[PDB]
Structure formats: C-alpha cells, structure tokens
Amino acid sequence: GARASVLSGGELDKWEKIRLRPGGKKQYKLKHIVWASRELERFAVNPGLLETSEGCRQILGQLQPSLQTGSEELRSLYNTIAVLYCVHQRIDVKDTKEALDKIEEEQNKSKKKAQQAAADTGNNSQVSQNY
Numbered sequence: 001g002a003r004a005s006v007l008s009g010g011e012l013d014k015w016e017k018i019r020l021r022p023g024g025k026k027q028y029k030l031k032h033i034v035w036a037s038r039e040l041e042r043f044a045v046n047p048g049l050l051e052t053s054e055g056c057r058q059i060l061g062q063l064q065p066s067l068q069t070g071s072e073e074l075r076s077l078y079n080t081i082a083v084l085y086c087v088h089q090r091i092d093v094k095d096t097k098e099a100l101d102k103i104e105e106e107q108n109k110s111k112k113k114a115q116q117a118a119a120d121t122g123n124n125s126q127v128s129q130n131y
C-alpha cells in the first residue's frame with residue numbers, strides 16, 4: 001500500500017548478514033524480504049505477521065505440513081521466512097541451511113515435551129521384590 005516492507009536500515013544490516021547457501025558467500029537482500037511478503041498475501045496469510053517474530057512462528061507452522069504438498073515455491077518461502085524469524089529473535093544464522101534446520105530441530109524438541117506431560121497424568125505405580 002502506502003508503504004511496503006518493515007525492517008528498517010538498522011535492522012536490514014542483520015538481514016543482509018545472513019548467507020544464502022551453506023558453502024557459499026551470497027547474502028540476503030531486500031528483494032527476498034519482498035518476494036516473500038508478496039507471497040503471504042496469496043497464501044491467505046497477512047503480510048503484517050512478518051513484522052513480528054511471533055507472527056512468523058505461526059506462518060512456518062502452516063507451511064511446515066505443506067513443505068511436502070506445496071510446490072518448489074513453498075520450499076523457497078520456508079527457507080526465507082526461517083531466516084527472518086532468526087533475525088527477529090536476535091539469532092544469527094550461518095546460511096539458509098543452518099537457519100532452516102535451526103527451526104526444524106526446535107520443533108522436534110517441542111514434540112517430545114508436548115507428549116511428555118501425558119506421563120504425569122497416567123498412573124505411576126512402581127513395584128520391586130527382594131530376598
């Protein structure tokens with residue numbers, strides 16, 4: 001509308017600090033911040049979510065289970081949005097690889113913690129014999 005893209009200069013310095021490839025030297029550019037935001041609108045997702053780190057958390061979650069269904073276009077997004085969330089959490093990644101994994105690995109740890117409380121609910125009755 002009247003203004004596109006949030007991340008200001010002071011913040012951009014961090015966005016342009018993230019690499020694109022694992023063993024490459026390419027970095028991120030505004031072009032990507034927009035190329036992604038312009039996708040959310042079509043992905044039934046509000047572009048005002050990328051403004052906050054929390055907003056992205058909800059986005060990646062939706063595209064997560066779609067990483068398989070969606071086409072190559074859905075893959076390029078996850079790799080991008082992943083770099084953003086890290087920038088907002090004051091987290092510095094090494095590239096589009098360490099970034100995506102840094103988020104994918106975090107979901108694996110939460111999965112166990114989410115299905116661990118069930119134990120406290122279940123009946124805990126131990127028993128041991130002796131001579």
Ligand SMILES: *C(=O)CCCCCCCCCCCCC
Nearest residue numbers: 001004005006033037047050084
């Ligand atoms: C006019 O109303 C267009 C509104 C454009 C949406 C703002 C872009 C979202 C902020 C930047 C996205 C960050 C992705 C790395």
